[PDB]
Amino acid sequence: MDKYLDQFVKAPPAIKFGGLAFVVGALTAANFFMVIQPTEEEIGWAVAERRK
């Protein structure tokens, strides 16, 4: 059905780009958390080693 298809020729450059952007934002949140966790683990191994 075509009215939706020309709504698809007018707009979803914007909507596809937006979706890509929300995804990349999520993935950057994830990798930042995945660099914060090795920090904590690392301070932990510090505290073990010094106790040795």
Added chain:
Amino acid sequence: CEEPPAPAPPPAKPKAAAAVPVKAAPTETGAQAAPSYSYVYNPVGKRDPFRSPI
């Protein structure tokens, strides 16, 4: 608190464990003696005196 042990590390034990261990040695050491024993003694013998004087 500290947990089942602490976090990752576990943690903190650089303090507990560092002002501990201890120092062990552990001195697997200073137990009980058999001592040891000397040996006895050198004579053949004779007579002299005391043959004439008895």
